[PDB]
Amino acid sequence: MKPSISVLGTGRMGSALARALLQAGYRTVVWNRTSEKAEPLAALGATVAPTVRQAIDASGIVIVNVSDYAATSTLLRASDVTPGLRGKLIVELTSGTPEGARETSQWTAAHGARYLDGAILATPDFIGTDAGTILLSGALEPFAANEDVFRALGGNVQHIGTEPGLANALDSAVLALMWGALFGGLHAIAVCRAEEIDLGELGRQWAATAPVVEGLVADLIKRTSAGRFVSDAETLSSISPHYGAFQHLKELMEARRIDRTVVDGYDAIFRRAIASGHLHDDFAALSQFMGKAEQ
Amino acid sequence: PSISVLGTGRMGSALARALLQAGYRTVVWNRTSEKAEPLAALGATVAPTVRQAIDASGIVIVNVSDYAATSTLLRASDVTPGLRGKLIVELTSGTPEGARETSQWTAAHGARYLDGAILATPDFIGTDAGTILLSGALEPFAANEDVFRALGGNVQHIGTEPGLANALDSAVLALMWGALFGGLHAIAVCRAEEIDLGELGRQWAATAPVVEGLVADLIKRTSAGRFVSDAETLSSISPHYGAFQHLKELMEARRIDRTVVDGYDAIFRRAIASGHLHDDFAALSQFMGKA
Numbered sequence: 001m002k003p004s005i006s007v008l009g010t011g012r013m014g015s016a017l018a019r020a021l022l023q024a025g026y027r028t029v030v031w032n033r034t035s036e037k038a039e040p041l042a043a044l045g046a047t048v049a050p051t052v053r054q055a056i057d058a059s060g061i062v063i064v065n066v067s068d069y070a071a072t073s074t075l076l077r078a079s080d081v082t083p084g085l086r087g088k089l090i091v092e093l094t095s096g097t098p099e100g101a102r103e104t105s106q107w108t109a110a111h112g113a114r115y116l117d118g119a120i121l122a123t124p125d126f127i128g129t130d131a132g133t134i135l136l137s138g139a140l141e142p143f144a145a146n147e148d149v150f151r152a153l154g155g156n157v158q159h160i161g162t163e164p165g166l167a168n169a170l171d172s173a174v175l176a177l178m179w180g181a182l183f184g185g186l187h188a189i190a191v192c193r194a195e196e197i198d199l200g201e202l203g204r205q206w207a208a209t210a211p212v213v214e215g216l217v218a219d220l221i222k223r224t225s226a227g228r229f230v231s232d233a234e235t236l237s238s239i240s241p242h243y244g245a246f247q248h249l250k251e252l253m254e255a256r257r258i259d260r261t262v263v264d265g266y267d268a269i270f271r272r273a274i275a276s277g278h279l280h281d282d283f284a285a286l287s288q289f290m291g292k293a294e295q
Numbered sequence: 296p297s298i299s300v301l302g303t304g305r306m307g308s309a310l311a312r313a314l315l316q317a318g319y320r321t322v323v324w325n326r327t328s329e330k331a332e333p334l335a336a337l338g339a340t341v342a343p344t345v346r347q348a349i350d351a352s353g354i355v356i357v358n359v360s361d362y363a364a365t366s367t368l369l370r371a372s373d374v375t376p377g378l379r380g381k382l383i384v385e386l387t388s389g390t391p392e393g394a395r396e397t398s399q400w401t402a403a404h405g406a407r408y409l410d411g412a413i414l415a416t417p418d419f420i421g422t423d424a425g426t427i428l429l430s431g432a433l434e435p436f437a438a439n440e441d442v443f444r445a446l447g448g449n450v451q452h453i454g455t456e457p458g459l460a461n462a463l464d465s466a467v468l469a470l471m472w473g474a475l476f477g478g479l480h481a482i483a484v485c486r487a488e489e490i491d492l493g494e495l496g497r498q499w500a501a502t503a504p505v506v507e508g509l510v511a512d513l514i515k516r517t518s519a520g521r522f523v524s525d526a527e528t529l530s531s532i533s534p535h536y537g538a539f540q541h542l543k544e545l546m547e548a549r550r551i552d553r554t555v556v557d558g559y560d561a562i563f564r565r566a567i568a569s570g571h572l573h574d575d576f577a578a579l580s581q582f583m584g585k586a
């Protein structure tokens with residue numbers, strides 16, 4: 001076939017989604033409240049639909065990419081547009097909860113629309129590339145039928161199961177890692193700022209040292225999955241040296257008036273693990289001490 | 296040159312093996328001497344005391360719990376007289392003031408000093424990727440570049456000022472712990488949403504380069520003062536905060552300790568309270584100071 005495809009939301013992402021569809025030779029129609037933010041996509045060859053309704057019935061698949069499900073829900077569940085959803089495919093690529101996916105599934109189905117709920121595990125620069133990862137959950141047929149449309153967004157766009165909440169559950173897990181790393185960087189930058197270290201140096205040192213962290217994270221997951229909490233020949237780090245080295249960071253942050261709210265959080269997990277006889281056990285032991293302290 | 300390693304831990308053992316593999320006469324000491332016996336068979340000499348170890352070799356690499364422990368091994372009246380003409384390489388984790396103090400005391404006993412941060416797990420010592428940052432005097436590094444190359448292909452001298460290594464160590468380890476506590480969270484979520492950790496594993500493999508781009512971008516942008524949104528930003532604060540809500544709610548609901556994420560929240564809210572809701576993620580770097 002080669003359908004017409006609509007994108008609702010011309011944000012930073014969404015704009016990317018749209019450009020990636022234009023670059024693969026799909027007729028792409030775009031709507032955005034604050035329509036001036038959608039003008040750039042006109043020049044790249046998209047048609048700028050004046051309203052949601054015009055957009056959702058100008059195309060046979062509709063990709064949504066706005067703030068949250070609350071905003072999706074006010075665009076698509078309006079009496080204005082709900083009648084037009086018949087036979088269309090809604091692909092909800094906005095960040096949401098698994099209950100949010102299950103609700104949006106049920107109301108789209110109730111208006112004669114097919115539903116795919118998706119988590120974009122990728123920044124704008126990755127949409128269009130063979131590396132671009134988007135996880136989609138929902139019915140299989142509407143995915144299988146349009147594999148060509150999904151390939152235009154990324155080479156690593158995958159269908160992961162029937163149950164439509166699955167994509168967002170996974171999204172929340174992966175985003176937990178992403179924020180850990182990023183708030184790690186925010187700390188790293190605050191330390192460098194305090195000890196008058198050029199961030200260029202931090203940059204070129206992270207380039208070199210990132211693979212070590214990747215090994216460490218991968219190890220955490222492998223070991224936790226296997227219940228290998230006790231120290232053994234294969235562990236690369238025990239809690240003792242982590243906690244020992246960590247002290248030096250706390251003291252530095254205390255001295256330099258850097259917010260400790262986050263690291264005091266780490267401390268509490270360490271101390272919980274050490275309170276059980278885990279001082280000299282693999283870093284993965286910490287995974288058993290993730291629940292709330294008070295009971 | 297004969298080379299001594301004090302501390303045959305998990306690391307240190309690695310340091311020792313890497314020296315033996317490059318054909319250095321390596322002597323090793325460890326309290327609880329049975330933990331150093333394995334290195335005998337790979338060709339190390341297990342010195343019964345610290346003193347015998349530090350005057351059996353001309354460079355001494357230290358790798359124990361903390362500077363307090365280094366200081367009780369080397370500043371004992373037993374051994375301090377033997378430190379003359381030696382090079383102490385302190386590769387144990389410590390503070391920058393700790394480096395500056397250990398510099399001054401070693402110099403006062405006629406010893407040369409390099410303070411080092413090992414930015415690598417044991418498996419990376421011996422490999423071209425192995426990264427160790429050394430600060431201290433240049434000559435004692437330059438003179439022994441071959442000894443450092445045996446520990447890693449990415450072993451660097453970064454400045455005269457001897458605290459520099461540990462300052463940088465604390466910054467880099469902040470990133471490392473961010474990621475790892477990120478994983479611990481990611482695992483708690485997976486456990487709650489009945490996701491097999493294998494799935495998390497193979498999804499992080501795929502998705503890690505995205506995070507690497509994001510972290511590298513943070514640093515490049517912060518260094519350049521590019522806090523305001525522009526054509527080149529891949530993420531603004533708004534969508535981060537929006538998606539973050541879904542994580543907080545999940546952890547609240549599943550009785551997962553929120554001490555950490557409430558910490559993130561506070562930084563977001565501080566950035567948003569200034570007109571930075573739709574600015575690059577890097578803007579958050581300006582809201583890292585206390586209350």
Ligand SMILES: NC(=O)c1ccc[n+]([C@@H]2O[C@H](COP(=O)([O-])OP(=O)(O)OC[C@H]3O[C@@H](n4cnc5c(N)ncnc54)[C@H](OP(=O)(O)O)[C@@H]3O)[C@@H](O)[C@H]2O)c1
Binds near residue numbers: 066067068121530573
């Ligand atoms: N940025 C990334 O790298 C990335 C990656 C993965 C996931 N995501 C997800 O992708 C989505 C898009 O993020 P983004 O970076 O594109 O954000 P953004 O540039 O800040 O734009 C948000 C978009 O949502 C629209 N919107 C917001 N509130 C709305 C409302 N109440 N009613 C209608 N439309 C509304 C905006 O229209 P207006 O112009 O009128 O505000 C705009 O099109 C988010 O759900 C985010 O969680 C983003």
Ligand SMILES: NC(=O)c1ccc[n+]([C@@H]2O[C@H](COP(=O)([O-])OP(=O)(O)OC[C@H]3O[C@@H](n4cnc5c(N)ncnc54)[C@H](OP(=O)(O)O)[C@@H]3O)[C@@H](O)[C@H]2O)c1
Binds near residue numbers: 358364387
């Ligand atoms: N593991 C890593 O990947 C890694 C990363 C970078 C740097 N480091 C740093 O390297 C150092 C060692 O780490 P590790 O993994 O080897 O820790 P570890 O396996 O627990 O070993 C600690 C070593 O320090 C010795 N030690 C501790 N307190 C001592 C004292 N009071 N007197 C004498 N020796 C003492 C221990 O002696 P005993 O064995 O008899 O107890 C042992 O040899 C730490 O500063 C750590 O922060 C480690």
Ligand SMILES: [K+]
Binds near residue numbers: 092094096119168
């Ligand atoms: K979604």
Ligand SMILES: [K+]
Binds near residue numbers: 386387410411412
């Ligand atoms: K050190």
